[PDB]
Amino acid sequence: XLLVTVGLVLA
Amino acid sequence: MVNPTVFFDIAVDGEPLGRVSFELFADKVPKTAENFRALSTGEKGFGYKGSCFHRIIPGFMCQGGDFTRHNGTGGKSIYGEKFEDENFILKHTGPGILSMANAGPNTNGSQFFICTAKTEWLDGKHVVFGKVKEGMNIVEAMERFGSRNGKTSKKITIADCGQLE
Known part of the structure; x- marks a missing residue:
């Protein structure tokens, strides 16, 4: 999807 | 008091692209703005210079700030490994917003992203602390090397950075 994470980047 | 302006000089596989400068909203989010400002001058002995934009998704954002693992x-942060969400006064209203990446509530470090579109779904979850002041055309140029999954086709790096004002 459209997230901005640090560690587990999701869809 | 005037908000600080910091700059990044961007290179693409070692070739200079240009300069992007940012205004940091220290008047609304003092702690988050300070963290980004000190990592741009490298004054604590570590920072963004030489690091890369590891994830660029065209029409969404350019993400960077991993100066330890690079991946x-x-x-x-300059406050320890992680710090709290200072406030969510500002929203992800359009191209040029500077915001913090994280892994959930109160996990801010050094990673950040520059939005190339309005991303209202991140409002209340990611702390907005600056905006592109000059050089939005260099951010647009950077998008050409990204992909739907985020991998870049060229190495995009912060060749130099610092504070202007």
Whole structure:
């Protein structure tokens, strides 16, 4: 999807 | 009091692209703005110079700030490894917003992203602390090397950075 994470980047 | 302006000089596989400068909203989010400002001058002995934009998704954002692992898993703040969400007064209203990446509530480190579109779904979850002041055309140029999954086709790096004002 459209997230901005640090560690587990999701869809 | 005037908000600080900091700059990044961007290179693409070692070739200079140009300069992007940012205004940091220290008047609204003092702690978050300070963290980004000190990592741009490298004054604590570590920072953004030489690090890369590891994830660029065209029409969404350019993400960077991992100066420890260089791969999207690291970086740290000037306050320790992580710090709290200072406030969510500002929203992700359009191209040029500077915001913090994280892994949930109160996990801010050094990783950040520059929005190339309005991303209202991140409002209340990611702390907005600056905006592109000059050089939005260099951010647009950077998007050409990204992909739907985020991998870049060229190495995009912060060749130099610092504070202007």
